[PDB]
Amino acid sequence: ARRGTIKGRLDLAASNITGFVSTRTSFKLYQIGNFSTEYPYTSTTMFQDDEGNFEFANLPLNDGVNETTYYVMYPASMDFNLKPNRILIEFKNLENGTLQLNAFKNFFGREYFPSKDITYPEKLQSMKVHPYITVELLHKAPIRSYLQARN
Amino acid sequence: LTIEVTKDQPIIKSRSPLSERKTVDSVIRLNEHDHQYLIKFEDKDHLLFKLNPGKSSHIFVTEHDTNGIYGYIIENDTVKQTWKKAVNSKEKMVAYSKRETTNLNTLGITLGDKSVLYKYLYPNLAAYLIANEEHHTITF
Amino acid sequence: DILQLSYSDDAKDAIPLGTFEIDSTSDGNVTVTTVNIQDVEVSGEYCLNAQIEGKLDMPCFSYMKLRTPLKYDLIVDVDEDNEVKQVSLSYDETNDAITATVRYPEAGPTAPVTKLKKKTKTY
Amino acid sequence: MFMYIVFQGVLMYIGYRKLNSMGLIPNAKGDWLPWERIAHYNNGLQWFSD
Amino acid sequence: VVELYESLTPDERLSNSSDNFSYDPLTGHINKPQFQTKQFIFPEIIKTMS
Ligand SMILES: *[C@@H]1O[C@H](CO)[C@@H](O)[C@H](O)[C@H]1NC(C)=O
Ligand SMILES: *[C@@H]1O[C@H](CO)[C@@H](O)[C@H](O)[C@H]1NC(C)=O
Ligand SMILES: *[C@@H]1O[C@H](CO)[C@@H](O)[C@H](O)[C@H]1NC(C)=O
């Protein structure tokens, strides 16, 4: 059987943050669509490398006529604020036989796929995934900033 | 054990067995004034507990398992089952809470035009969950 | 689907109290019929017993202070599959008898979220 | 000569009618919430429990 | 969240007069609530609440 495999790397290179701990940030995967396993697949990973690689593997899959499997990845940092904050994963069959990868950039509290009746609905933004899924901190507020200061 | 808390270091002012040397699952606090306690042993055995002097008038006490929610009543220095509510086989009780007692401020939630909706104050309530497989039905 | 309802002394026996039947007439609507209710002298604190042969047997599902002018609304509770799920009793002033209602779970909101707009593609 | 008091009284009417009856009336039910009685439900039971 | 109200009508104290009624819970002649419920969308998985 053929499986999926998530590849990804949070950068921490545009940032100069290198005194981070790497144990307080966790990516998590969930399955929603067209699953026959009597429980949707789920997983949780930690980092792999100083430059920040993270990876899921042995992913179950649907197979046949453009058979889709909807995964969702939760980019978060408990020390930073990650700009994506939600990721869609789309895993369809090619008629050629290969399995096509597509991901999208949702945000907290919107529908993922349109509501099956809107004619010509809006489509979510895809992201270049040739090297890997590239998650990033917020450009403008990289730090989580728990501490409110007086004044 | 009965332990004396003092500004000095404590002292173990008593050690003793319970009435039956059985393994205990939990203890539920009965009345402060009457100095009673209820002990639930694993094997699901309930013991009334008259500890010490500490030197109709019904009491109701209620306990939960994943098999069900049961309820219990104490009278005449004895415990009796008062009813039972078990979920069925496929089902499993998941989450439970009782009503914490509350000192009362306002008997009703108001509206803009000084109008009042009278929030519901009944003290004898608990709430709970049931999750059933294949139904995929969180029941509250 | 016949239910038998009986109060018990919990030491002597379960003395019968009534009989009801549950029919699924429509596609998705069950209903209760009172085939017969057998009222005798009732006064004081009693534990209830409910049994549908086959599916259900709730031996001690409730405990109330009962009186012979039975003035209760008997909520039997069902779910999407037409199967009895629970049996319980509340007080309603207007019956002067036992009348039973079947109940569906009063489905929860599934409250809303932001939706994708309608042709925000060329507009 | 009682015209002066009849005339002046309605000027007491106008403020109470127009502004003090904006939200500041006694005798409507929302003013007795501090004085509302504490409903007694059990009165002979405790219900200690877990 | 579910919030429990005596009457969903804007102004009604349903069967809560307390001067000397002294309701009995054991018997089951208590009032029964009406309820209103909503839910919310939350970012992170919740272990436990108090
Ligand atoms: C799931 O499978 C059904 C067919 O069983 C199909 O109609 C549907 O589009 C698939 N995807 C989702 C998200 O339901
Ligand atoms: C995939 O989709 C194309 C769309 O034209 C369809 O013709 C083909 O049958 C589908 N099959 C597979 C195996 O992906
Ligand atoms: C064969 O699969 C590749 C991707 O693996 C795809 O780009 C190509 O279009 C497929 N061939 C045809 C004839 O569509």
User: For residue C114, what are the β-bridge partners?
Assistant: A110
What DSSP string describes B61-77? Answer: E--B-SSEE--EEEETT
- Nearest-Cα distance to chain B for E46, in Å, is 13
Determine the Cα–Cα distance for residues B55 and B40; give it in Å rounded to an integer: 26
Partner-chain contact E39 C108, CB within 8 Å: yes
What tokens appear for D42 in the block?
């059990």
Cβ neighbours for B83, distance < 8 A, ≥ 6 positions apart? B70, B71, C47, C48, C60, C61, C62, C63
Ligand 3 pocket residue status of A97, Cβ below 6 Å: no
Does B64 touch chain D if contact means CB atoms closer than 8 Å? yes
Radius of gyration of chain A (CA): 17
Determine the Cα–Cα distance for residues C20 and C13; give it in Å rounded to an integer: 20
Nearest-CB residue to A109 (from C114, C120, C121): C114
Ligand 3 pocket residue status of A149, Cβ below 6 Å: no
| Secondary structure letter of residue D8 according to DSSP | H
Probe site for chain B from E1, E2, E11, E15 (most B CB atoms < 10 A): E11
Does C64 touch chain E if contact means CB atoms closer than 8 Å? yes
- Nearest-Cα distance to chain D for B33, in Å, is 12
Q: Compute, in angstroms, the gap from residue A117 CA to the centroid of ligand 1.
A: 15
For chain C, the first-to-last Cα distance in angstroms comes to: 59
For chain A, the first-to-last Cα distance in angstroms comes to: 61
Q: Compute, in angstroms, the gap from residue A100 CA to the centroid of ligand 2.
A: 12
What DSSP string describes B109-133? Answer: -B-TTS-B--B---SS-EEEEEEET
**Are C10 and C58 spatial neighbours (Cβ–Cβ below 8 Å)?**
no
How was this structure determined? It was done by: cryo-EM
C-alpha to C-alpha distances, B98 to A116, B126, B132, nearest whole angstrom: 43, 4, 22
b (16+ CB within 10 A) / e for D9-30: eeeeeeeeeeeeeeeeeeeeee
Label residue A3 left, alpha or beta by phi (over 0 means left) and psi (-120 to 50 means alpha).
beta
Question: How would you classify the pairing of strands C72-77 and C98-103?
Answer: parallel
Label residue A70 left, alpha or beta by phi (over 0 means left) and psi (-120 to 50 means alpha).
beta
Atom of ligand 3 nearest to the CA of A94: 2
Ligand 3 pocket residue status of A94, Cβ below 6 Å: yes
Question: How would you classify the pairing of strands B11-14 and B2-4?
Answer: antiparallel
Nearest CA to E35 out of D38, C113, C75, B140 is that of B140
C-alpha to C-alpha distances, A40 to A62, B3, C106, E49, nearest whole angstrom: 12, 52, 27, 26
Residue to mutate, A62, A66, A96, ligand 2, most ligand atoms under 8 Å from C-beta: A66
Radius of gyration of chain B (CA): 21
Determine the Cα–Cα distance for residues B113 and B126; give it in Å rounded to an integer: 33
Atom of ligand 2 nearest to the CA of A92: 14
b (16+ CB within 10 A) / e for B20-45: eeeeeeeebebeeeeebbbbbeeeee
Residue to mutate, A30, A31, A32, A34, ligand 1, most ligand atoms under 8 Å from C-beta: A34
Partner-chain contact A111 C117, CB within 8 Å: no
**Are E12 and B118 spatial neighbours (Cβ–Cβ below 8 Å)?**
yes
Which chains form contacts with chain D, at 3 or more CB pairs under 8 Å?
A: B, E
To one decimal, the resolution in angstroms is: 4.3
Sign of CA dihedral A86, A108, A72, A78: positive
Ligand 1 pocket residue status of A33, Cβ below 6 Å: yes
Question: How would you classify the pairing of strands C63-67 and C72-77?
Answer: unpaired
Q: Work out the number of other CB atoms within 10 angstroms of the CB of residue A27.
A: 24
**Are A129 and A101 spatial neighbours (Cβ–Cβ below 8 Å)?**
yes
Nearest-CB residue to B124 (from D25, D38, D42): D42
Smallest CA–CA distance from B58 into chain E, residue = E26
Query: Which residue reads 């015209």 in tokens?
Result: D3
Go through chain E and tell me how many residues it has: 50
Determine the Cα–Cα distance for residues C2 and B41; give it in Å rounded to an integer: 38
Determine the Cα–Cα distance for residues C101 and A118; give it in Å rounded to an integer: 41
